[PDB]
Amino acid sequence: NMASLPATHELHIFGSINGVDFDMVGQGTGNPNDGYEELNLKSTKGDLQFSPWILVPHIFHQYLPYPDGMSPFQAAMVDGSGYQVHRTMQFEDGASLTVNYRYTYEGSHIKGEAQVKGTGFPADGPVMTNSLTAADWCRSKKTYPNDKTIISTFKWSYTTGNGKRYRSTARTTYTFAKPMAANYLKNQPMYVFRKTELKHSKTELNFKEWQKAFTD
Ligand SMILES: [Cl-]
């Protein structure tokens, strides 16, 4: 499957944060043997009026291998059957952010479409005042309640400029067109440690992600 696993990708991520529209597009690459991703995005609607960190972690688990071979995400890309994704994040200050994903594949190139709705961020808070500066390591837990569904949960924390943490909880649901292989369903839960990096201006960002799946 080396030729059918992903090597390059692009993302169109769009929607609104507090009812204000944004839209970004750009190109990336990654390594499906070790989880790595890197992505450049540029705004198509002018300066971003909120912290670009709010788009992290949302800005391609097709790059995630499992400990003993392909992940289900990889398997579903390689056989063309695919999957869809929905995530909800609920923040300590009562805000929410939803995102849904659809993908298409052209050989080893992935095209992603991510539709975002962020609601209820306080005007004064670190999102709307562009005061987020980093994100903690994050441990995700994946369970498989049936042969076509993965549920992933995690707690998330950003660091802010004034040394506070800004916390949220997330639940992600994956819907597979074809049943997942039996070994995945037997070997649950699966955990994944990830780390993200972001450098940004008001119009452009450079993102990186590292991922490592494990049981015990
Ligand atoms: Cl996830």
Coordinates of C-alpha atoms and ligand atoms in Angstrom, one line a residue:
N1 CA 0.0 0.0 0.0
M2 CA 3.0 2.4 0.0
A3 CA 1.9 4.1 -3.2
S4 CA -1.8 4.5 -2.1
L5 CA -1.1 6.0 1.4
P6 CA -1.2 9.8 1.5
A7 CA 1.9 12.0 0.9
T8 CA 0.4 15.4 0.1
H9 CA -2.8 17.2 1.0
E10 CA -4.8 20.4 0.8
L11 CA -7.4 21.9 3.0
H12 CA -10.3 24.3 2.5
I13 CA -11.5 25.3 6.0
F14 CA -14.3 27.8 6.3
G15 CA -17.3 28.9 8.3
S16 CA -17.6 31.5 11.1
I17 CA -16.4 32.3 14.6
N18 CA -19.0 34.3 16.5
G19 CA -21.1 34.7 13.3
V20 CA -18.2 36.2 11.3
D21 CA -17.2 34.4 8.1
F22 CA -13.6 33.1 7.4
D23 CA -12.2 31.0 4.6
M24 CA -8.7 29.6 4.2
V25 CA -7.0 27.3 1.6
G26 CA -3.6 25.8 1.2
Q27 CA -1.2 22.9 0.6
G28 CA 0.5 20.4 2.9
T29 CA 2.4 17.2 3.1
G30 CA 2.8 14.4 5.6
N31 CA 4.3 11.0 6.4
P32 CA 1.9 8.1 6.9
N33 CA 4.6 6.0 8.4
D34 CA 5.0 8.2 11.4
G35 CA 2.0 10.5 11.7
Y36 CA 3.7 13.8 10.6
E37 CA 1.7 16.6 8.9
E38 CA 2.6 20.1 7.9
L39 CA 0.2 22.5 6.3
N40 CA 0.3 26.1 5.0
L41 CA -3.0 28.0 4.9
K42 CA -3.9 31.5 3.6
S43 CA -7.0 33.5 4.2
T44 CA -9.2 34.3 1.1
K45 CA -11.4 36.9 3.1
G46 CA -8.7 39.2 4.6
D47 CA -7.4 39.5 8.1
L48 CA -8.5 36.9 10.7
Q49 CA -10.3 38.7 13.5
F50 CA -9.8 35.8 16.0
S51 CA -6.9 33.7 17.2
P52 CA -5.8 31.3 14.4
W53 CA -5.1 28.8 17.2
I54 CA -8.8 28.2 17.4
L55 CA -8.5 26.3 14.1
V56 CA -6.1 23.9 15.9
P57 CA -6.5 20.9 16.2
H58 CA -9.0 21.0 13.4
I59 CA -6.6 21.8 10.6
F60 CA -6.0 14.3 8.3
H61 CA -5.9 11.0 10.2
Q62 CA -5.1 9.3 6.9
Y63 CA -1.5 10.2 8.0
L64 CA -1.9 8.2 11.3
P65 CA -0.4 4.7 11.3
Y66 CA -1.4 2.1 14.0
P67 CA 1.2 0.1 16.0
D68 CA 0.9 -3.0 13.8
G69 CA -0.1 -1.6 10.3
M70 CA -2.6 0.8 8.8
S71 CA -5.0 2.7 10.9
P72 CA -8.7 2.4 9.9
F73 CA -8.5 5.9 8.5
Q74 CA -5.6 4.7 6.2
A75 CA -7.4 1.5 5.2
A76 CA -10.5 3.4 4.2
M77 CA -8.4 5.8 2.0
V78 CA -6.5 3.0 0.4
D79 CA -9.6 1.0 -0.6
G80 CA -11.5 4.2 -1.7
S81 CA -14.5 3.5 0.6
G82 CA -13.7 6.5 2.8
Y83 CA -15.0 8.0 6.0
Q84 CA -16.7 11.2 7.2
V85 CA -16.0 13.1 10.5
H86 CA -17.8 15.4 12.9
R87 CA -16.2 17.0 15.9
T88 CA -17.7 19.1 18.7
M89 CA -15.5 21.0 21.1
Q90 CA -17.1 22.6 24.3
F91 CA -15.0 25.2 26.1
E92 CA -14.6 26.1 29.7
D93 CA -16.2 29.5 29.1
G94 CA -19.3 28.1 27.6
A95 CA -18.3 28.5 23.9
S96 CA -18.6 25.7 21.3
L97 CA -17.0 24.8 18.0
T98 CA -18.3 22.2 15.6
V99 CA -16.5 21.0 12.5
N100 CA -17.5 18.5 9.8
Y101 CA -15.1 17.0 7.3
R102 CA -15.4 15.5 3.8
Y103 CA -12.5 14.2 1.8
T104 CA -11.7 13.2 -1.8
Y105 CA -8.6 11.3 -2.9
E106 CA -6.5 11.6 -6.1
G107 CA -3.8 8.9 -5.7
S108 CA -1.7 9.9 -2.7
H109 CA -3.2 13.4 -2.6
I110 CA -6.0 14.2 -0.1
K111 CA -8.4 17.1 -0.6
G112 CA -10.2 18.1 2.7
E113 CA -13.2 20.3 3.2
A114 CA -13.8 21.4 6.8
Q115 CA -16.9 23.4 7.7
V116 CA -16.6 25.2 11.1
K117 CA -19.1 27.0 13.4
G118 CA -17.7 28.6 16.5
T119 CA -20.3 30.3 18.9
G120 CA -20.2 32.0 22.3
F121 CA -16.6 33.1 22.6
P122 CA -16.5 36.0 25.1
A123 CA -15.4 39.3 23.5
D124 CA -12.8 40.0 26.1
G125 CA -11.6 36.0 26.0
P126 CA -8.3 34.8 24.6
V127 CA -9.9 33.6 21.3
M128 CA -11.3 37.0 20.3
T129 CA -8.4 38.9 21.7
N130 CA -5.7 36.8 19.8
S131 CA -4.1 35.8 23.2
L132 CA -3.6 32.0 22.6
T133 CA 0.1 31.0 22.2
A134 CA 0.6 27.2 22.3
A135 CA -1.2 23.9 22.9
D136 CA -0.5 21.1 25.3
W137 CA 0.2 17.5 24.4
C138 CA -3.2 15.7 24.0
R139 CA -4.1 12.1 24.6
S140 CA -7.1 10.9 22.6
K141 CA -9.1 7.7 23.3
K142 CA -10.8 5.9 20.4
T143 CA -13.6 3.4 20.9
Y144 CA -15.6 1.5 18.2
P145 CA -19.2 1.0 19.2
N146 CA -20.0 -0.7 15.9
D147 CA -18.2 -1.8 12.8
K148 CA -18.7 1.5 11.0
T149 CA -18.1 4.0 13.8
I150 CA -15.2 5.4 15.8
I151 CA -15.8 7.7 18.7
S152 CA -12.7 9.7 19.8
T153 CA -12.6 11.8 23.0
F154 CA -10.0 14.2 24.5
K155 CA -9.5 17.1 26.8
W156 CA -7.7 20.0 25.2
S157 CA -5.7 23.0 26.6
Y158 CA -4.1 26.0 25.1
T159 CA -1.6 28.3 26.8
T160 CA -2.2 32.0 26.8
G161 CA 0.1 35.0 26.7
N162 CA -0.5 35.8 30.4
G163 CA 0.3 32.2 31.5
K164 CA -3.2 30.9 31.9
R165 CA -4.6 27.8 30.4
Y166 CA -7.8 27.7 28.2
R167 CA -9.5 24.4 28.3
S168 CA -12.1 22.4 26.4
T169 CA -13.5 18.9 25.9
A170 CA -14.0 17.2 22.5
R171 CA -15.9 14.4 21.0
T172 CA -15.3 13.3 17.4
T173 CA -17.4 10.8 15.5
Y174 CA -16.1 8.9 12.4
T175 CA -18.6 7.2 10.0
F176 CA -17.1 4.6 7.7
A177 CA -18.8 3.6 4.4
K178 CA -17.5 0.0 4.7
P179 CA -17.1 -2.1 7.9
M180 CA -13.8 -1.8 9.7
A181 CA -11.6 -4.9 9.9
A182 CA -12.2 -7.1 12.9
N183 CA -8.7 -6.6 14.5
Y184 CA -9.5 -2.9 15.1
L185 CA -12.8 -3.7 16.9
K186 CA -11.1 -6.3 19.1
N187 CA -8.1 -4.1 20.0
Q188 CA -9.9 -1.2 21.6
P189 CA -9.5 1.3 23.2
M190 CA -6.7 2.8 21.1
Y191 CA -4.9 5.8 22.5
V192 CA -3.1 8.5 20.5
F193 CA -0.7 11.2 21.8
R194 CA -0.5 14.2 19.6
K195 CA 1.3 17.5 19.6
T196 CA 0.6 20.6 17.4
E197 CA 2.6 23.7 16.4
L198 CA 1.4 26.9 14.8
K199 CA 3.1 30.0 13.5
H200 CA 0.8 32.7 12.1
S201 CA 0.1 36.1 10.9
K202 CA -3.3 37.7 10.5
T203 CA -3.6 36.1 7.0
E204 CA -1.4 33.0 6.9
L205 CA -0.4 30.1 9.1
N206 CA 2.0 27.3 9.1
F207 CA 0.9 24.2 11.1
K208 CA 2.6 21.0 12.1
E209 CA 1.3 17.9 13.8
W210 CA 3.0 14.8 15.4
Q211 CA 1.0 11.7 16.3
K212 CA 1.7 8.3 18.0
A213 CA -0.9 5.6 18.6
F214 CA -0.6 3.0 21.4
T215 CA -2.5 0.5 23.5
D216 CA -1.0 -1.3 26.5
Ligands
CL1 CL -10.0 13.2 16.6

